[PDB]
Structure 1
Amino acid sequence: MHYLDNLLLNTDSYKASHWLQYPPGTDASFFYVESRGGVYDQTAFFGLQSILKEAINRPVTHADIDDAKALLAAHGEPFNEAGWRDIVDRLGGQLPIRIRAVPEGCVVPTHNVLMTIESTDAKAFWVPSYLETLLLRVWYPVTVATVSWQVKQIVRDFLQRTSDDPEGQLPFKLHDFGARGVSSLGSAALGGAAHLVNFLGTDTLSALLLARAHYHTPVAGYSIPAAEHSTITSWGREREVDAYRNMLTQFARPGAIVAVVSDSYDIYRAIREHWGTTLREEIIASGATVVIRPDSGDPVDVVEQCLLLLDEAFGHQVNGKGYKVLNHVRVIQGDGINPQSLRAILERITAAGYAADNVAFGMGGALLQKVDRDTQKFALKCSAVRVDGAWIDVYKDPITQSKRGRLTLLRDRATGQYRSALLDEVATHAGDSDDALVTVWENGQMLREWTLEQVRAHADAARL
């Protein structure tokens, strides 16, 4: 909200003093971003466009400088008032930087240049380092998009093995439940949008708002009516069956999908005791698909048990791949879901002869919150600075060979393989490779911009 609308204070304190630490005669700087490794060997790049639209949404003003000067002096940090006033008076408050990035949605192996940031003004050379804090938080949507993309490859493998329509089923198989389990509204919106790079299903309404505001997508994803277990219990134990019947009355129509939550024990009770007969009849009669969500028991075992019991209650058809597809009902597991338990569910139910069509997964905190900057070892590093007119390589260690100088990313035309390279190598390899970065932002203006459908196309084409 309004209280955070000062770019000059959107940084680590010690970076305010940073411009005093450069050698004399410095007049340019050059930084890049990469994943240095971590959980996965490749990352889906996403979220920079939102960060730039939201964190740099207007020119810097003299009022911003007044406010920052007062706060930083009371807080304990030096502040380059004169440098920022020059940016406001001479450059219209527009940040003198150029940002290039790989198109959002592309999946890039680790240890590769994902973005670069370069100063465009000799006197205000220090601006890139000032933005390190807000830019480096691109680790978050990158890492969430990556986790969701890795899960998609797992689900896709099993649908390719067991489903007659793998790519028609896939977009609905991982549903975001994480809005209550993430650390803030802004994180829900941006993290939720990172999941929508890969899937259509979300309960995180905030992600629809961000996709609509920042990625030109009015309705980025979908959901269905679903029961809350507490409101079921509030009918009392004697009318428990009537609460589920009300769910059908309100929402079960032909072509409609509605989700019901129940503990595992009560699902077994309804499939044995004869009060479930009325329930089975109205389910069949409605023409809807009813998704059952078990919310107790071992996350893996209970799915297989639901499939076996629902099979006994509703029957199945055998599809073209030889796998069973339940009639009328499906299962979603929203508990204990992370990439490892999800795979374990898929291995277990397909070994039992059930199509992956039968099952979907809800992920909450494990999707939006249980990630950190170390997950994909995200880093923003200075690789070159210009002193007295000469560019000099900057680096910590010489060998992982270490990236230095003014860098870019290349894509091999024949193989599609990515590699990092000096800007001077784009000319010499013009026949076999193309520069894979694009200029997304320069001197206060966003240049290349994506819709979410464009991002989704890049990510969907990538495979393991």
Structure 2
Amino acid sequence: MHYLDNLLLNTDSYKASHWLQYPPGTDASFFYVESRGGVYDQTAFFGLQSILKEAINRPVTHADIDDAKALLAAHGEPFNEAGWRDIVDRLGGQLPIRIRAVPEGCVVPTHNVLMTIESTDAKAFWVPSYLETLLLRVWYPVTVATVSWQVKQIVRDFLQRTSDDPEGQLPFKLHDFGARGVSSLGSAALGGAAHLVNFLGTDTLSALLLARAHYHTPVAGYSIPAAEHSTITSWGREREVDAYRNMLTQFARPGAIVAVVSDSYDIYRAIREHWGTTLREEIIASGATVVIRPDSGDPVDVVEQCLLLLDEAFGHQVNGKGYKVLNHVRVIQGDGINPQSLRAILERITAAGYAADNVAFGMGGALLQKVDRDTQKFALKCSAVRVDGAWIDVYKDPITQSKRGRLTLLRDRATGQYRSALLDEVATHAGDSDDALVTVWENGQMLREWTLEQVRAHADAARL
């Protein structure tokens, strides 16, 4: 929104004053971004394109400078007015930086250069450090994309073992429910979009809006009509079955998919007590796939139970792998899902003989909110400065061998393995490796740009 538009105020306060802290005769700076470890050994890189389009969407102006000079003096921070005025007057307000990055969607082992930021102007060498705050927030779409990607590898494994069509099934197995459980609208759009790197099912409309505006994708994902807790109960307990039948009247057509929520005990009652008998026929006659979502009881146990109970209500087919596929009905567990309980469910149900085709998984806050900058120990570090015309390495520990100097990422041509290297070694090892980064942004201009489909192809091709 409009009150946040000024780029000069999109930073931590203390970093506005960093230009005064450089040695005299400093001429240039070079930064890199990496995951220093954390929950997973590899990260799907995603979201930088959206961050750049949204946070650097116009030249800096004199009005930006006036506003930032006034606020920062009152707030108590020094502000390099003359430095910003020169950038506006001489460089047309375009940030004199070059950003290189691994193509979005690639999956890269931890401890590797994911992007570099370099100054492209001697006077305005300090601009990269000014952008650390907004750039380091790339940790969020990277981490969400990674969590979603890791779940995809678990689901893909079980579909490969138990499904006749594992890649036809896989895009719909993890559904984003996190729009209400995430901390703002912008994070819903960006984290939801990061999920869509790996799957097609989402209820986070904001992610469609971002994918459409920033990743050239008119309709990045899909969903289905689904019942709410509130709507069912408000019919009253004496007409509760009529609420479910109305779901069928409104949405159940051949080839259509409709979800209904119910607590686990009512599901058991409906299959035992024969008032659900007319619900079964209307379900069967509809030709629709009715997805049942249990919303009480143990997240793992209840899936297996629903499968067994629905099997006796609706029957099953045995597929080519020897696993049962229920007729007409499916189960989605939307509660308590994380990579461990998800794996537990899949282990439980396939051991019971049910194909992974039968179940889907909803994740909300656990996908979009329960991540932080430490999940993958994200860092954005200075690695080199040019002083008195000479580049000097910048680092803290000499060990982690530690990354220093002007850096890039290499991909080995035969194996596809990644490794970080000095820009000095992109020759030399030509023949065995190619430079895996690309220039995505330079001096106010976005250069290399991806569609979400291009992002999806990198992520889908990556395996554990």
What range describes the TM-score normalised by the shorter chain of this pair? over 0.9
Q: Which runs of 5+ in 1 are unaligned?
A: none
Quote the Cα distance in structure 2 between the aligned partners of 1:60 and 1:133.
Answer: 17
Q: CA deviation at 1:32?
A: 0.2
Q: Which residue of 1 aligns with 2:224?
A: 224
Quote the Cα distance in structure 2 between the aligned partners of 1:229 and 1:13.
Answer: 45
Quote the Cα distance in structure 2 between the aligned partners of 1:74 and 1:111.
Answer: 40
Quote the Cα distance in structure 2 between the aligned partners of 1:311 and 1:419.
Answer: 50
Quote the Cα distance in structure 1 between the aligned partners of 2:161 and 2:129.
Answer: 49
What CA deviation, in whole Å up to 9, does each residue of 1:405-452 have, x standing for no partner? 000000000000000000010011111000000000000000000000
What CA deviation, in whole Å up to 9, does each residue of 1:128-160 have, x standing for no partner? 000000000000000000000000000000000
What CA deviation, in whole Å up to 9, does each residue of 1:224-245 have, x standing for no partner? 0000011100000000000000
Quote the Cα distance in structure 1 between the aligned partners of 2:220 and 2:239.
Answer: 38
Q: Which residue of 2 aligns with 1:179?
A: 179
Cα RMSD between the aligned structures?
Answer: 0.3
What CA deviation, in whole Å up to 9, does each residue of 1:101-143 have, x standing for no partner? 0000000000000000000000000000000000000000000
Q: How many residues get paired? A: 464
What CA deviation, in whole Å up to 9, does each residue of 1:8-51 have, x standing for no partner? 00000001110000000001000000000000000000000000
Q: Which residue of 1 aligns with 2:119?
A: 119
Q: Which residue of 2 aligns with 1:270?
A: 270
Quote the Cα distance in structure 2 between the aligned partners of 1:360 and 1:339.
Answer: 13
Quote the Cα distance in structure 1 between the aligned partners of 2:16 and 2:163.
Answer: 56
Q: Does 2:94 align with 1:94?
A: yes
Return structure 1 stretches of 4+ with deviation > 3 angstroms.
none
Quote the Cα distance in structure 2 between the aligned partners of 1:369 and 1:340.
Answer: 17
Q: Give secondary structure in 2 for the equivalent of 1:344.
A: helix
Q: Give secondary structure in 2 for the equivalent of 1:248.
A: helix
Q: Which residue of 1 aligns with 2:411?
A: 411
Q: Which residue of 1 aligns with 2:400?
A: 400
Q: Give secondary structure in 2 for the equivalent of 1:43.
A: strand
Q: Does 2:202 align with 1:202?
A: yes
Q: Give secondary structure in 1 for the equivalent of 2:57.
A: coil
Quote the Cα distance in structure 1 between the aligned partners of 2:287 and 2:404.
Answer: 62
What CA deviation, in whole Å up to 9, does each residue of 1:57-106 have, x standing for no partner? 00000000000000000000000000000000000000000000000000
Q: Which runs of 5+ in 2 are unaligned?
A: none
Quote the Cα distance in structure 2 between the aligned partners of 1:117 and 1:389.
Answer: 19
Quote the Cα distance in structure 2 between the aligned partners of 1:427 and 1:208.
Answer: 41
Quote the Cα distance in structure 2 between the aligned partners of 1:265 and 1:312.
Answer: 16
Q: Give secondary structure in 1 for the equivalent of 2:431.
A: coil
Q: Give secondary structure in 1 for the equivalent of 2:149.
A: helix
Quote the Cα distance in structure 2 between the aligned partners of 1:298 and 1:29.
Answer: 54
Quote the Cα distance in structure 2 between the aligned partners of 1:312 and 1:100.
Answer: 57
Quote the Cα distance in structure 2 between the aligned partners of 1:272 and 1:20.
Answer: 75
Q: CA deviation at 1:345?
A: 0.3
Quote the Cα distance in structure 2 between the aligned partners of 1:98 and 1:127.
Answer: 11
Q: Give secondary structure in 1 for the equivalent of 2:259.
A: strand
- What TM-score do you get using the length of structure 2 for normalisation? 1.00
Quote the Cα distance in structure 1 between the aligned partners of 2:188 and 2:97.
Answer: 29
Q: Give secondary structure in 1 for the equivalent of 2:117.
A: strand
Quote the Cα distance in structure 2 between the aligned partners of 1:430 and 1:266.
Answer: 65
Quote the Cα distance in structure 2 between the aligned partners of 1:458 and 1:248.
Answer: 39
What CA deviation, in whole Å up to 9, does each residue of 1:390-413 have, x standing for no partner? 000000000110000000000000
Quote the sequence identity (%). 100
Q: CA deviation at 1:331?
A: 0.1
Quote the Cα distance in structure 1 between the aligned partners of 2:431 and 2:207.
Answer: 41
